[PDB]
Each structure stands twice: as C-alpha cells, then as structure tokens.
Symmetry: C6
Subunit: 101 residues, 6 copies
C-alpha cells in the first residue's frame, strides 16, 4: 500500500501543473485525478513515503504559482489501509478499460 | 442488514482520510463512496453497530484534521431496512462489474 | 397512481435515514432516489395517501436528527396524474435492468 | 410544432408537483424533464397555446406551494420552430429506447 | 467553417427561447446546446457571419424577456478555425447516433 | 511530450473564443476541453513551447474581450512528464471512439 499522495485544487489548469510537479519531483506514479464537483479536482500519486512527500511538496508550490492556481486541500497517508484501495480511486487504471468501453 | 455507517465531506482528500480511519478503527467494510455533486462526497462502511460506531467516530476526527477537511454530514442506522439496500449504494460492488464494462 | 411521497435533502447520509424512516413508518415502497446536483437528493416512496403521509412525516424528523441532516424540500401528490409517472422517476426499476446493462 | 411549455425549478420534489399540475390543468403532454445541474430542473409539456398556457400557469402556483418549491424560470413558445425540436428535448421519448439500452 | 454563433444563459427555459429566436431571425442551423453545469447552458448555431449575427442578436433580446431569462455570455467567431470543430460541440449530431446507442 | 497549454474560464462562450485564438495564434493542436463543474472549463492545446506560449497568450486576451469572458486559470508545462499524459486529458481523442459508442 505504498504511501499515497494527493492534492486538491480549484480549477483544472492548476491541477495539471500540480500533477506535472509531483510526478517530476520524485519517484511517484500519477494514479489518477478525481472530480468532486464545484471546480474541485484532486491529483493522486503513489510511491514511497518520502517520495510521495517530496512530490506533494513541489506540486503545491507549482500549483499556486499558476495563473489561477488554488490548492484547496492536501494529504498523504504513509501506509494507507488496503480495503481503502478497493473503494477509492487511489489505484491503477487502463487495465479493465477494454471491457468498460 | 448489519449497521451502516457513512460520513459526508466537502473535498475528496478529506473523504479518503475519513475512509481510511473508519476501516482501521473497527471491523467495518468500506462498501463505497457516493458523489452528490457540489464538492460533497460520502463514505460508507458496514459492520456491527458498535463497530460501525467506533469507526464513524474516528473517521470524523481524522477527516477534520486534514488540510481542508470539512465533515459535512454523518449518520448510522443500526439495523437499516432491507429494501433500502437494493436502492441505495450501501452494499457491495465488484461482482457484476464484468457485465457492466 | 397511488399517492407519491418524496423528500429532498442536502447530503447523502441524511437522505438514506429519511428513506429508512418512510419505508418503516408506513406501508410505503421506496421507489427510488433522485440526484439534482449540488448536494441535493430526493427519496421517493409510494403507497396510500395516509400511508405516504405518515412516512414522509417520520422521514423528515429522522433526517433532521442526522449529523448534518438538512431536509431541503418535501411533497406528496395524493392521486398524481399518470402521464407524470412515465416521465419522472416516481415508478419502479430493476425490471428493464438486464437490457440497459 | 404545437406550443411548448416548460418551467424550471430548484429541487426535484417541486418540479414533479409542477409537472403533475400542468398535465392536469390542461390537455398537455408531459414530454420530459431536463437537468441543467446545480439543483436546477425543467419540466416540459406540449399542447395548444392556451392549453400549454393554462397548465404552465397552474404548474407555477402548485410548485411554489411545495415545502421548498422554488420556480426558477418559465417560458412558452406558441409556434416554436421545427429545427429546434430536433436539437432540444422538447419532443417524445420511449421509442428508440430499445436501441439505446 | 461558416461562422459560429452561441449564447449562454442561466436556466433552460431561457436557453430554448434564445434558440428559437436565432434559428428564426436568420438562416442559421441550431447545431446543439451545451451544459457547463451550475444552471449554465449555451446554444450554438451556424450560418454566414451576418446571418449568425442577426440571430445571436434577436436571440439575446428574446431570452431576456423570458420569465427568468438570464443571458450569461455571448460570442461569435466569423471564420472559426477547423481543428476547433473536431474538439468542441460546434458541429452536427444525429449521424453516429445509431452506433453510440 | 511537446509542451502543453491550457486555459480555464468561467462560461462556455468564453472558452470557445479562447480555443479559437490559441489554435490560430500558433501551430498548436487543440486536444480537448475539460469541464470541472461550477461554470469552469479548460481548453488544452499542444505544440512547441513558444508555439504553445504565443497561443495561450492570445487566447487569454480574446477570451476576456468576450461578452462575459472570465479567464479563471492558466498554465503551460514545457516538457510535461509522460505518465501525466496517460492519466489526464492532455492527449488526442477520436480514435477509440468507435469502441466507446
């Protein structure tokens, strides 16, 4: 359940820049982006605890510097419980895509 | 119809942390997360009444401590009526997934 | 066109408790739950006029007592017009489910 | 292109009551209900100009009397242009339903 | 890429009246209506520059006269770039409908 | 991962004009438009860094001049990480469209 790092934000252009940062600032895998509605959107990454940290870190600074960047919330569980992974979009995609479509 | 515990929240990062808590603080199964729109999202678990309690409890404290955590609503029916289970997302998933896709 | 009873609410956990009430407080069948967007969600039941009443009644008290329960709107047509039933989600589901999927 | 009558409203319970009225107050056919998002929902009927009137009239009074009824907008084109009918949900449904599903 | 004329509006009944106008006031084809969420909805038409003008014109006056008409935004590109047409809903529908369904 | 340029905006008519600009002001390919909810919508283009710049530039001026144009956010990654491309809508569409439908 390698640490999970996510960061919410108001606006899409700022969420992309946050995602580009996290994935660059550390050895973290961008797992997905979640839309809660009301201009709110989270970006989730996975990797070690200090990896997931270093990236959630940068991500936030880069997001805010955006022409409208508004980091709404931020969090990271180090060793997030497993059951959690089969209920939330903290995991991988692409795979069962052929079946969905 | 083992007790049902859910907790709403504004923002996704705070709903995940709420879910990670509930599922850890007790013997409860995270059944799913519901999106009502407008930054609002609920997390639902299942287990005994005191199990579902102990977890909805912790969940709320952990959510609020989040960098933007905003617990919107909270509830738990101890012995929630059956018909209710076949109309609301209080149950299990994964199973008929192959057919949907 | 047996009377129709519904109750809107802000938040999902409060809408479930409202539904658990109505369906218990009287001989009413929970037909479905509607999402209008913006944290708003209605619960609809069917039964006699006094049955659909007694339940929409309880439902409201139980919803409000919820940790965030916010009953938004409430209504009941006693003998609601038929055409209405084939345009709104006031009816039954499950049946043409195999075809949809 | 028999006149078209519709009425928007905040909340679902109030839109249903609006629909139950229009379809009763006149010889109008409830064609459908549209969701624009943000608690907003329209109800559309069809019939003569004075029929579509008499019903959009009542509809509004009945909606407002609802425990949360909030008529947002209201309109009626008497002889609404045809092209319009093949781009907006002002028409009939049910028919190509078997193919969709 | 014959000029494109669109007009946003708060509420559905006002967007329909806007659409009924544009399509009548000129030789323009109502291509579609877009929902951005939050009671906001645009209506798009196509035709010459002066045709698409004359209609976006009327449309706005007719929309505002509606019992709740609220024209939110308005625009028209005369010779809108092609790539744009294969990314936005400025074009025609109906055609690949059988496949979608 | 040729530079990515996007610009958010409140309202749809202003997002279209922004897109019409970017795609004209430079050698950039409009990849798509994203809806975050709450009247917010982004437009994304791809091309060189200075190409993607020159266009995100114009786009913003043209959007603001719109009858309701409200540029919400703005950004551009020059060499945006690859993983990012398989999680966000920064890429191409049309292709697997036949399968989706």
């Amino acid at each position: 359940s390698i640490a999970v790092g996510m960061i919410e934000t108001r606006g899409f252009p700022a969420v992309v820049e946050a995602a580009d940062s996290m994935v660059k600032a550390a050895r973290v895998t961008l797992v997905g982006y979640e839309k809660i509605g009301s201009g709110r959107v989270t970006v989730i990454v996975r990797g070690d605890v200090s990896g997931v940290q270093a990236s959630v870190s940068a991500g936030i600074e880069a997001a805010n510097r955006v022409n409208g960047g508004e980091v709404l919330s931020t969090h990271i569980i180090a060793r997030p419980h497993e059951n959690l992974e089969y209920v939330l979009p903290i995991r991988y995609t692409e795979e069962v895509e052929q079946f969905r479509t």
